[PDB]
């Protein structure tokens, strides 16, 4: 039975993946700004729907090895949808429908992450949890960098605004999703890994935000970027502390503290440089 459900999932995932690729090609084969906008909206819409359909069936996969496959399917669809949108938007530039591209990536990243977390919330193996965490972090990281790069290839305007907020929102949600799944870990080895996953993501989100305000030396964004950076660091740290509190072994408690101090210092330096600009 699990095979039946999983097979329906693989089928839907393959179909969607292919449709996404076809839409992306059409947008590049075509010569108009609208072709790009339509593929971006349709890729995102289809990817969203595919993910939701998968979650709907995936919830019946009592056995973890199938759940793992469902998570992978979601993550793969999300990655392809994001990359397809990125490519079209990046090729297009000219500040036209670029906000849609940023929003679409962020929305897909959120959808996929929460869907993964939702399925992941129903299992018990530690390795599985780690895989779910990894998938979330993977998606968040890719989405952040795709968004970052798009803003650099548009130059200032409002695209960097969208990017700063999108990154902060995504990173925050990803962190909390990780913290939530991570709260079910049984050993320090795994809790520490979750902490690090958070810390790495937080650092990357901060660097992307930092770079966007910094490379445009723009006071509007210096202020927003600073607030976003502080926000990320505070939440990342609190998430870490929640998890850290369940660690009973000093080697890991100390590691977590070092990580927290590192995040805080990184955030502070990014802020200081932006203030000086």
């Amino acid at each position: 039975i699990e095979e039946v459900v999983a097979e329906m999932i693989d089928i839907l995932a393959e179909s969607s993946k292919k449709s996404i690729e076809e839409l992306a090609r059409a947008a590049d084969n075509k010569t108009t700004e609208k072709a790009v906008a339509e593929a971006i909206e349709e890729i995102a819409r289809l990817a969203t729907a595919a993910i939701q359909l998968i979650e709907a069936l995936a919830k019946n996969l009592a056995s973890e090895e199938f759940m793992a496959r469902a998570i992978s399917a979601i993550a793969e669809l999300a990655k392809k949808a994001i990359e397809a949108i990125y490519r079209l938007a990046d090729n297009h530039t000219t500040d036209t429908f670029m906000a849609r591209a940023i929003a679409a990536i962020a929305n897909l990243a959120v959808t996929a992450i929460l869907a993964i977390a939702a399925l992941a919330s129903n299992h018990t193996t530690e390795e599985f949890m780690a895989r779910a965490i990894s998938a979330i972090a993977e998606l968040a990281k890719k989405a952040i960098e795709a968004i970052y790069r798009l803003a650099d290839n548009h130059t200032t305007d409002k695209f960097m605004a969208a990017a700063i907020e999108a990154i902060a929102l995504l990173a925050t949600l990803a962190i909390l999703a990780i913290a939530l799944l991570a709260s079910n870990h049984t050993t320090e080895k795994f809790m520490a890994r979750a902490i690090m996953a958070i810390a790495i993501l937080a650092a990357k989100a901060i660097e992307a935000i930092y770079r966007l305000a910094d490379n445009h030396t723009s006071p509007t964004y210096i202020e927003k970027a600073i607030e976003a950076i502080e926000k990320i660091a505070r939440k990342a740290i609190k998430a870490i502390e929640m998890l850290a509190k369940n660690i009973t072994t000093e080697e890991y408690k100390e590691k977590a503290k070092k990580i927290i101090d590192i995040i805080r210092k990184l955030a502070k330096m990014a802020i200081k440089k932006l203030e000086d600009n």
């Binding site: 890994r193 690090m196 810390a199 790495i200 650092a203 660097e207 590691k255 070092k258 990580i259 590192i262 995040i263 210092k265 990184l266 330096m269 990014a270 440089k273």
Partner: protein, 120 residues
């Protein structure tokens, strides 16, 4: 001696211009003639680093640091060479040292955390 000064200058010029191979050859001369020039040990290590010659970069960075323990950049680059070779424990220690000397080195801090993750 004048020989050391010329060797140093040629090394430095080639180094700045990206001809690291040339710089290496010149620095070996500068150091053979004057082993205490920490700057040549350092630039030599960088010239090798730039070529992917990480073991050499490590040896020379270590020498530069023995002569000048406060060279935060050398500590940083030392950590980077260890990092590139997969020795995260060492990269971690050296990133921390570079940071103690220079707390503003964001990249060292970021790399410290990344090394910590890779070491596990």
């Amino acid at each position: 001696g004048e020989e050391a000064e010329l060797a140093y200058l040629l090394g430095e010029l080639a180094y700045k211009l990206g001809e690291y191979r040339i710089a290496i050859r010149a620095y070996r001369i500068a150091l053979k003639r004057d082993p205490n020039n920490a700057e040549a040990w350092y630039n030599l290590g960088n010239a090798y680093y730039k070529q992917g010659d990480y073991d050499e970069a490590i040896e020379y960075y270590q020498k530069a640091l023995e002569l000048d323990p406060n060279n935060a950049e050398a500590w940083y680059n030392l950590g980077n060479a260890y990092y590139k070779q997969g020795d995260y424990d060492e990269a971690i220690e050296y990133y921390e040292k570079a940071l103690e000397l220079d707390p503003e080195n964001l990249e060292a801090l970021q790399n410290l955390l990344n090394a910590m993750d890779k070491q596990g």
